[PDB]
């Protein structure tokens, strides 16, 4: 049961959060954040700078000195501390989601009912994690005891996107802590508030000050800062290729410090004439339309073998026009408006070029209300590999069909990307099921499902999607530096 | 015992490696390798540029192709061709030894105890490993079966330096062929003639065309290239801090491949009072002066305990005025010479930059002859943290000792480094060394030993010394690409 | 802070409990539980047999079908079920404590602050690891893919001793549910009150009815009973070395279920000449006296460097006699009564033989009040390896101090026993305690410390004193039950 | 191609095998083993008795001793040692192929391209393990260091059967040695010369005196003195259930050493009625008829879905009519003898209970030559599960083929038995695979495939089939016993 929404949540929290304190930044400059669903500014956030990254990385760099309260504390401790945590976002949940809503533009219902659910379930599963990395002990050659201590890498920098911005947070504070990092945040422009708050509740929850801290601000100057700073060891990054590659450049330039990046793909949902017909139509439309399209993984090329294509496209074409678009806050909604302005027109100028291109045009097209963000589910039908919406990240409710015959074919077609963060298949045949499995060279397949995120199992791209696995035993890797002790022994034996 | 070298061994291999075949350049241009004891050309190299790097990617690419031998082949038959290729190492091991030290300076003796048997235990290790490296099955969370596939990354540019010829080929290509990835390996300008041997050994063994492909040439060519492409899915390069910079924004500025690095240091070696002096002097001896103080992981400061302090110098400065230096190939030496002209100078430059800022010189200094590289083992005391003898690796026969009085005092100063590749202690103390084990920020710490490698143990840096690691199961780690399969299931139970 | 305790806590729960509910034995006998402070009873308990096992396994079994609540639930959601436990533990920690202490005797600082804090931690720890066991996917040669099921081992029989009735039920349970097992376990007749409260509160946090079933009752009948079912999977006890192989003889006659064992020990603590003394005398104390001298893992020879023996003895009869025998509740109390009559007479009668056989009494020797099971603080100096009192585990406080000369020496005296549970050492110097951890016959190994249990690190037997880890990941093996699947694929690659 | 074989290979192995040398039995009395093919005796062997078994354990005892060169040796170098015996073997694959085939009754093409080649697969897979199955460290609560060893439980007693003599030998074998122990190996009396000669090849490969130990003789005599013996630490046993009920009391009577086994099944193998059915006639042909019956894993219950029944009866009966019985030594035979008279007439005993109890006989049931142990390949039709048939193994060329409706039906008839080694489902669905695969009560459950064994996957019992795994990782875990050090520490830091 969802409990109701207030649908004006009060804003506790808007400045950079530094050794557990509220400062502004030393500029004194603001930035409005505004509401997607009507234009409207809710209010100004500290516009953190490279000065106000400076102060947090030395917060980060003192609580992480040997002997801290932070490196002393049990591992288990770490656990206790992140299911605290937990509790606290629980406590406050119904609070949090409306407050994702506002900022962020998706429906209420799925920002308590996945969203919330989601960070809840990852910081608890990660919490798990915090006493069970075990290091080796290694039968070395010759008269040695060797062994590895699992240590933390030490300073992280965490630069999240827009989309998700409470369960990215999550995905990056869960496995830091767990092993015992230090974290200096930068949240999106777009949607800095819930993060914020969460930061309240990092200090309720009894972490020692500078362990984390978050600094709202822009990209090319607080983003950037953090990825080109001498004492941040290591850098986490999620959103575009573009600032992918100027987050790698950034540190090769600096430092060295250490890097993995969760860029975007052109994800393929492969429908085989065997597959569930309704299953396989209700799944490929929230693979494309959940979050209002703006998913790292997105199935936003919907390969559809010819047999079963045009009856395929029949009902895909009833169910976007069935989707009902409006206040994010009403119970009815399934699609909010997209986060801003920005990503408004870029995504209307995909469908004029869609339309140029000579994609069938088939519903949505425009805008679907005279307030706030809003687009019409749109869906081309008859796509080609060469056109522009087959190869670019769209980040919307514009969906693509594509037909296709072979087996053979298709895997060719949804391998030939530069992209490789995820892929489906839909089919009832085993051996199908296996070769596609295989073949597909992406981050994950999905297999007569899509969008199955388990704090369990691993998540991350392939050729420009990204590097590095996050979620999972594989999300502690990047977080963890390793360190071998060999000792010399008066003699070995097995 | 050790057979008696060909002093003067026959070069059978001098030409690009592409497809189990022999290439000159494109350009047909070729440039002298020399040997470093005499100054004199042993041979001339085919000299690889870009576009022989664009036939040996194509030819790797191709060999990485699903449904190739090298793709279908089972992985417990990759650990059958390392073997092999180990096995025909060991038959080749004199001529090798002598070759490696015809081009690299480093005495026979330990070409033939030390590089190869380091070679062959390193092949073998990793040949272990070919059927081992699991994937996970994992509890995710709804009716779903969910497992990983580990992956080869597919094709990795491997960019390796002169110091350990051999063995730097073996600790690239042991966990890239047990993992089933392909490589185009570019060897050192400096000695490139023992890899090329081993690609003939690489073909003996039964390994499919494009599998290995070595391109030797120079660094801001057929290096740049490799670090550039587009095709190249990882690359690992082994050297300076000032190209390492570089690799690591030309992965950033082309296709974001996957990055890892092992650069310098100025590794810490501290001898507390407790210690054995005996043992401390001889091993703090090769610590620093091991293969002509060209080692990575060189324990180029020397702390050492007031108390000892005096005692342990005039046993050090004893010792390296007994060094032998002379003719790699007579038995009686110690040292051979730098492995070329712009080392020798470089190193020159660092003692006369010693001597100037006014370190104790305490022996050595000089040219130790006409001929060649050679240089006298240099011992300067009194060394302060401040220095640049201090600070920078010099990667010559330089020793460092400073003095220290506590071992709180000790840690902050050995860590007061931007690298961190390695550390030991010596002391008999069970606390101190626990202590100091755990308080040093660097990838090995050894403890009353120095320079133990094991293929078991992984070995890298912290800081800017590198970031992976390379040895151990944890070698792997870089050379797998990781790929989650959630597949829906009529009903999960545990 | 500890608060204060209530000295006749009431007790709510004396019945079996099946399918979440209490029940009285079929035959409706019942057996009295003793306070061992006072000679008196506390109240009578239901006395299960072998049809109240009947029905506890039937449940059982029930519960474990596939599709059932249990078997369906999410591996993550059993981890919140153990960390609600956990929760309900620490709300009644007090009470718990209190009612510990009047079935045991142990003092009540004791049961809150060292075994509810160890419960707490042991099930907290538990709670993460229910969803992190992988299974594997394995390179399998040929056109296969193959991977591992990790699954429960099913119907779980439990059989545990008094001597830490909480911790103990923790130890078993944690690992057991996190793994989606069932429960039927049998609780030691001396001590039955506190666990069948703790099943009071797994009702109370919501694990469904069949999943953990309580049968008290004595050992021929309840226990055997459970040893001998057919439908029983795995048993894990936890006693005496004679009851041990009558469970594993049990389990061989009957189904062949799978079997662990955690049996006595007459484990070596060693003090060699260059030990702290304070330190090694003050753990030598608490290695031998904790918990009444009733812990599995006691360091009941103390094995004492001969330059140091004369005042290492001194200083533990002074311990040893300043040690506070007395009211289990009064904050003063160090020792707490022997649990029962039984042990009571057991323990006077090894006193005895120590005396006959000529060990040196130097302090204590006989009763320490004229009511309730209270023996005092005795120390027996120059032990010799061939007497009673040194080779059979005595469970009570009497202290057997031994003389040694050389490490050599010591090493095969301290591994001269039929038993292998745990030893320590008590040295300064790294060499030798590096070649004693090595050299003893031990699962568990304390250098300068005792009795450190963490539930990260695994806990068992060598020789007769049993098989089998508890506690860390390994804790996890004995509860699960491997599958491999292996399918046919089109075409396997790498 | 296969080389021709050696018909009347020579024995140059007969004895009992201790500390690398051949030792005629105490009591000096031998025992014949027979050529099943002709009912002849090959040679005798000398009968081991407990005095044997006591002699062969203190000679594995003396070679486990601490500072032994075996105890001492590399890890690496045990791998080296297993390399090298499977090289050996090889070398003398042509001559251990006939042997096997002359002792046991197999066809020789079998034991070549089979057995042989998966014995140097085994020994060669484990050789890797030797320097890789890693103990840990382990972040505890506290100041502390906390690590694991993984050292080798000890002397292991291996008591082997008949069905695949070299196989099994390398199944125990290279676990145990890849790990540091030391063996007693019991061989079967039916089949112990292949065996014996190994042993041979063990001393030429350089494993040290006592290391292994062979001793060949009766069940009642030599094996129950080893599964009683004192000084023996962990029995693996492979054989009837019976002697598995046996073994196990044995070790709980004796000095309770740890216990694997591998029992009998009575394997489901269920033909859904959309599996390719040309395939699965020849695999379920196969899953049955291969090695003579002789297989732990047989496919013994063939449930078949209804609407196929009668064309998959008539394509087995096809099969099993055509399959050729023979001379083993004959490249056409696909079948030899059954191992001895015993097996001979309680399988033909089997046919008459068969015959009586209703089942419809559809070929074969009765003997296939007049001399040797040779029967017609036999299929019973119309089988229930009530029939003596259905339920007990019958380890011969005896085929039951049982019908069913649906999956839910065949799930539960599965397993409805006491066994649980295998089981087997031929389908086209996903969906199906997936739910009998994870509903079925086996150790291995193979998918359109059947007796896919590799040394990377582990196998072993369910239920009454046995406890514990062999191959794989897993085949380590009961060669290991795990010790924890935990070490006191100034300041323990993450
Ligand atoms: N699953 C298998 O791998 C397997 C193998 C052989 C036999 N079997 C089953 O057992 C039946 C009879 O065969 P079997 O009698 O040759 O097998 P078995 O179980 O009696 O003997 C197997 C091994 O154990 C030894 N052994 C026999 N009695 C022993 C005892 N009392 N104590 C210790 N060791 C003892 C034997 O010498 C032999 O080495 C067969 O019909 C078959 O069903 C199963
Ligand atoms: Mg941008
Ligand atoms: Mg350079
Ligand atoms: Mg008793
Ligand atoms: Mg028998
Ligand atoms: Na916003
Ligand atoms: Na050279
Ligand atoms: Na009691
Ligand atoms: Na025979």
Redesign the interface.
């Known amino acids: 049961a969802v409990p109701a929404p207030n649908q004006q949540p009060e804003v506790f929290c808007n400045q950079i959060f530094i050794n557990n304190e509220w400062h502004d930044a030393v500029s004194r400059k603001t930035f409005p954040t505004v509401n997607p669903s009507t234009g409207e500014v809710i209010c100004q956030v500290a516009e953190g700078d490279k000065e106000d990254v400076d102060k947090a990385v030395k917060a980060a760099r003192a609580a992480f000195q ?2 801290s309260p ?8 770490r ?2 501390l992140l ?1 605290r945590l937990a509790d606290l976002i629980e406590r406050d949940r119904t609070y949090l989601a409306a407050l994702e809503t506002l900022d962020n533009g998706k429906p209420y219902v799925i920002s308590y009912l996945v969203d919330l659910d989601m960070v809840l ?1 990852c910081l ?2 990660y ?16 008269d ?9 890498v030490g300073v992280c920098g965490q630069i999240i996107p827009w989309n998700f911005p409470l369960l990215m947070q999550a995905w990056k504070l869960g496995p830091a802590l767990a ?2 990092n230090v974290v200096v945040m930068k949240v999106a422009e777009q949607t800095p508030l819930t993060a914020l708050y969460v930061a309240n509740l990092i200090k309720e929850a009894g972490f020692p000050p500078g362990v984390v801290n978050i600094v709202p601000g822009f990209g090319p100057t607080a983003g950037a800062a953090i990825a080109s700073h001498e004492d941040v ?1 290591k850098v986490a990054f999620a959103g575009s ?1 573009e600032i ?6 950034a ?3 600096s ?2 410090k ?2 993995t ?1 969760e ?1 975007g793909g052109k994800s393929p949902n492969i429908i085989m004439s065997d597959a569930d017909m309704d299953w396989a139509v209700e799944q490929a439309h929230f693979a494309l339309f959940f979050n209002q399209g703006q998913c790292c993984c997105a199935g936003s090329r919907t390969f559809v073998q010819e047999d079963i294509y045009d009856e395929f496209v029949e009902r895909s074409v009833a169910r976007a026009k069935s989707r009902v678009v409006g206040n994010p806050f009403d119970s009815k909604t399934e699609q909010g408006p997209q986060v801003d302005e920005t990503q408004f027109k870029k995504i209307l100028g995909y469908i004029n070029t869609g339309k140029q291109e000579g994609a069938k045009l088939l519903c949505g097209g425009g805008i679907a209300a005279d307030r706030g963000y809003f687009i019409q589910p749109t869906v081309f039908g008859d796509v080609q590999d060469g056109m522009t919406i087959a190869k670019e990240e769209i980040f919307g409710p514009v969906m693509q069909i594509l037909k296709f015959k072979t087996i053979e074919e298709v895997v060719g077609r949804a391998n030939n990307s ?1 992209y490789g963060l995820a892929a489906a298949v839909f ?5 199908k ?3 596609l ?3 597909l060279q ?8 899509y969008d ?1 995120f ?7 791209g ?3 999607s ?2 590095g ?1 996050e979620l ?3 999300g502690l ?1 990047a977080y963890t ?14």
């Open positions: 040997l002997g932070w490196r002393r504390m049990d591992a288990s401790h656990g206790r299911n379930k608890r599963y919490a798990g994690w915090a006493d069970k990395y075990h290091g080796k002990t290694i039968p070395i050659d010759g040695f005891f060797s062994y590895t201590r699992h240590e933390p092993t015992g060891d290729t992918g590659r100027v987050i790698q450049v540190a090769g330039s430092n060295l250490r890097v990046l860029l530069t089919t009832k045949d085993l051996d099921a296996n070769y499995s295989q073949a992406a981050g994950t397949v999905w297999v007569n499902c199955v388990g704090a369990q199992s691993p998540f991350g392939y050729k420009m990204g590097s696995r999972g035993e594989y890797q530096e390793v360190k071998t002790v060999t000792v010399k022994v008066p003699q070995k034996n097995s």
